[PDB]
Fold this protein.
Amino acid sequence: NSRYTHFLTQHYDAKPQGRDDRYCESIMRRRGLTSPCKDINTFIHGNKRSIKAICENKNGNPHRENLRISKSSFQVTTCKLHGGSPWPPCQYRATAGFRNVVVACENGLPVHLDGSIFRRP
């Protein structure tokens, strides 16, 4: 459904190239997260099959109040907004990582990504 589809749009990029600052600034614009500029957004890479499986016990475990945490690790890239304005141009700093992720599932589909685990304040 629509929520799973939207999840894939702001949080999934199967095969990115260099996961650098330029990559971030480009995929953020591409996925329309630049008006206003999202403060931080993480993309998961890899195959969708593994992401959907986090909703089942095959690749996930219950987490906190109503989330699921993946068993396998995923390659990810977090784009963090740099600068004092929430309006384009949006400059982003990229951080490539590799760990498990936390999502919320709806009818067996990931519909939300808990991005808190990617922001080290």
The helical segments are 2-11, 21-30, 48-52.
